[PDB]
RNA sequence: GAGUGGCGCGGACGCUACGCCGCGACGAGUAGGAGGGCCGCUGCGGUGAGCCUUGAAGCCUAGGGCGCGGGCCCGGGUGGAG
RNA sequence: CGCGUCCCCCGCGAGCGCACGGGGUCGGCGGCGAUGUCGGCUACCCACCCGACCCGUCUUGAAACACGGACCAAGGAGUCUAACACGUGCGCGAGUCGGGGGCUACGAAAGCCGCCGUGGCGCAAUGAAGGUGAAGGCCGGCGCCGCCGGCCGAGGUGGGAUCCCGAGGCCUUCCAGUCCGCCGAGGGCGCACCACCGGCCCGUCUCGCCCGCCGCGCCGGGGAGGUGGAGCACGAGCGCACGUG
């Protein structure tokens, strides 16, 4: 029940939301893993533009 | 070589002190004559009266131009209409104690309270013991006892009310400068009647204490005081 | 900090700052927007007027990047080129007037809101006010379109 | 105040070398604790 | 028993800054002295300066300074602004100015330091005038944040001019029912 | 940047600059004084007629 | 279940607590409600007030020029009276000065 | 050293707060070259401590 | 300066002891022992310390010199004082009051002194 | 206020300026609001050259006390590792 | 209560001392003290006088013949996320922010990028939309001209904290006479902010002429006066943290 003078606001949170989440804990390992994977293909390709 | 600044400092110091004793003498003078002043004004009421009985006239005297009220009922249950004039005759608390000049305007504010109020016409003697051992001084907006006649000279002095005396002479011979010395006085914290009150309620005409007693209340104000 | 909350300071109290009376209870008016038409009418009324109803054209596929259209006004015209070429362009004798590409900076419509200093401009802008167009032939410039 | 004083280097051994820097504009940077 | 109302004899103003940077509260403990000591009016306005939030002491721009210096009998005075003195883009001359500010902007400082003017701090200012002697003191607009167009008297409601709190600005956004004379009524 | 060069305010104050620009520093203590009466104490009547 | 259904009890000692506000009387009123005709005209006799600017500059220098030929042509008790004159300090500095040496 | 000593530091024997040691000191790989170091710097009452 | 490292220091310093409603400062230079301002022996340029000898016997009085004060090793210049009450307590007076070395410490530094030779003198 | 003219080596206290001092008036309180806690619990970063098998935590206590209070500190008993 | 001087009516003397004098001192004393005595306020028990109904709760009203509670231990109820608003703290400031990406034990941290600001939010509004999109005056070339140029050029009134000038004046057996400071009659520039009055932009309506031109048109642009706008009128925002709703 609105209050006083308030922004009309509409939050989108009336689906089961909670069971789809998707948090961030990855997000260094992720960078790690990534950065990993480009360093080996740029080691597999000896001479060439490590970019492609 | 100091021996200049030694004099001169003492020249400085000796210069107040002769300006203390001649304002020590003014105020002893001013006092003198307000001691022949009341004396001219009581012996004159006489006089007046005395020469009309010997006529066979009468002489009606002045109506009185100087009240002291007394608050004689507490905080709890009062009219609004009341509330707000007892807050401007500044009595806020029971068995406070003001000073008010009357006129047309003042005793329809002091019939508007009469249930709420003791007052009457004050005595030279009940403006002195109130001034004296009750009198309070609204200095910076604080209640500091009148223990010097400095503290009177430096709020009133621009009015020429320089000590205790120019303060009860401005009160009882209600001056051009009533307005100002009455509200330097913080109203009367005065105590309970000792021998008790006759009747807090109804009116003093009806054997109470509330309304007007003319003469009377110079006889209450010694018990309170 | 859960310390600084007001919580912490209610623990010994009974109602939990909420009231005795009308108990917090758990959505006493509806949920959410519920009853703007109804019971809460006052409150969309006395702080959003217009909340209720249908005005204007529906325009289906709307594509921003069509009516993207970034507008400088002519006060702020002289930041998007060094101020080096401000000082010089008044030294210089010629009457020789440096260019504003006012789509390099990344605008397209130069809007007139502001005094221009006396100086001759090249703006190559896309759009242009009429305004900002006559200030900068006022001072003695060029308004040149660009695509 | 505004003026970097000079600051010496120490040797393995813990006494002054000959070599100096001048203290750098940080360590006069406003110390906020806030 | 005093019939006295106690709701207001509390007042509710600031007596120190809220803030527990250390360069403000030297700043302070320098005009808690000279606003008591000197007899200047200046010193009090200061002091109850330096309390104030960021938001009652909002930035002056370059532009009013060189504006409200620019006024008739006011040449060769140092601007004090205890707020913070911001660079203004739109403006292409700027004079050389005497400025006290506890922030002055870098591009700010540059703009009056390359017009021969001269940049103090409160320190400063004291040294250089302790009854603030010679000085016009300048405050930022209060009414400049965009929170003040939102206040008053609430929208939906016959001639207020009131921002109102809407999620976004577009044709369907808070448009009909109180706005227009088609769509039921217009305040 | 610092929003004061010289922190040092011992310095400050007591330089000639501030401590010619001061008034004279009130360090006598005034406590309250008591209350005598008119009828009573007879040098107090004295004092203020 | 029939409840109380109005009173007007309470609010008089509402009304009076944050006192009961007259108008915040502001100088120079608005010109809203004022009749179109007569606002229009109003504002055409502003418009026009840069055409008589001499016609006043130079009038208000005749009125000052009056008045620079009407400048130009222009030029209780006898003890406690005393004392009062002595007590204070600038007026009765030489009269203590003489109570000083008159001790000598 | 009024701040570094507040933290608790014992760096009464320490010839310069901003201590600066030669770029020798890099070079260290025993930390018995390490530990000699801070003996002669007098840093190591801070480690003792 | 001074008065800014006396805002970091006043709270929230390793020497600072706070309990039972009283305060206190440890710091090797304080002679009040107190946490203020004018008592704290790390802040200022001059700094008055009073400590025990060595030995059992005198008094050590610790004068903070003027220049290198970024160079604690140096800093402070320490000169010990065994002799009877009444000439320990006067060089003292004298060090602080004649070379005018924080003169507004004279006082607290003899009643330390005096507290510090009671202290080193056998019991009855 | 300032410039040219007619012997004995001495003096309490203070000012954690977020401190210290002075003077005045005042003090009901539900729902409710706000503030300050050197009130208390548990963990983390710092810190106290902290404490502790010459006895930690916990517990008991006709013991000695402190604080307006939340609480806390000491004594004595128990206990055994924080 | 010296007198050197002024005319109507006829500038510092030294001591001492007493105190109804800016909140109590005594330069007065006397008892008692080792196995029965002293102190210990609080705490343990007991007695007596006065007061004194049982808490929580809903309630106009509870000791209620209203409800819950036999007792004790332990557990046990405004949280976290998102959004928003306002307040406050901090940084930078017409900007601001890497948050996504990338580069280089604690470290899954921290540091860095700038041709990684893409992008967000702010810097411009207004209209349903096509769209349009935020000061002017004066002096001359042809008492009034479409446009030639010329120069000063972002309002006005009122109230406004502060500052500015300073008629006069604040003392040494005099009187000139500066420099330093300070007070002040009166006079000003007036911050923010408030009210009012103008102006400008957009929509719309009314009246009304006059310009423009690669395409002279059911074209384009301008004016005056009302009116609708969440505008302009020498920016305040952004990020972060905290509080409250």
Redesign the interface.
Known sequence: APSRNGMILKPHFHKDWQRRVATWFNQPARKIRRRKARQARARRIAPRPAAG | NFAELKIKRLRKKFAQKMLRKARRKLIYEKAKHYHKEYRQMYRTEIRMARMARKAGNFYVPAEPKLAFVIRIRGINGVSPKVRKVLQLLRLRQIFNGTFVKLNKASINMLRIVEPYIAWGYPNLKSVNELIYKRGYGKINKKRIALTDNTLIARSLGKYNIICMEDLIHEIYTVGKHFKEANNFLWPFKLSSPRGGMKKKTTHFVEGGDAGNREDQINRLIRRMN | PSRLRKTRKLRGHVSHGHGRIGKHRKHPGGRGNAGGMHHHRINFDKYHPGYFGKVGMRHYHLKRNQSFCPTVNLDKLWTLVSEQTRVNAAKNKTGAAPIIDVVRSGYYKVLGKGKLPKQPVIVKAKFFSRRAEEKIKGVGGACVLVA | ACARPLISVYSEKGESSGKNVTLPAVFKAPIRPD | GVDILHNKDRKVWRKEPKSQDMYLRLLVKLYRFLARHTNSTFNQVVLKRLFMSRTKRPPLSLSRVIRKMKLPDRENKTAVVVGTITDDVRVQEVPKLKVCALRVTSRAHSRILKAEGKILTFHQLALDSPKGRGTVLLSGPRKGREVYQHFGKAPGTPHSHTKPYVRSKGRKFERARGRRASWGYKN | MHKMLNTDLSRILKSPEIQRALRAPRKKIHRRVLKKNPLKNLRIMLKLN | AKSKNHTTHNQSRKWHRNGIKKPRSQRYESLKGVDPKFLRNMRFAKKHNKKGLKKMQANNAKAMAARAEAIKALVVSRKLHRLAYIAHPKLGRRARARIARGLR | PALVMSKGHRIEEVPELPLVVEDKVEGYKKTKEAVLLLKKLKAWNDIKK | ?????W???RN????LIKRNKQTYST??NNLKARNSFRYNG??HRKTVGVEPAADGKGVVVVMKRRSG????????VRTTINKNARATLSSIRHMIRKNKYHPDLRMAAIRRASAILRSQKPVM
Do not use: D
């Open positions: 300066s001074a008065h800014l490292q805002m970091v220091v929230c310093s390793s020497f710091e090797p790390l802040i004060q970024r160079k604690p090793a140096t800093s402070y």
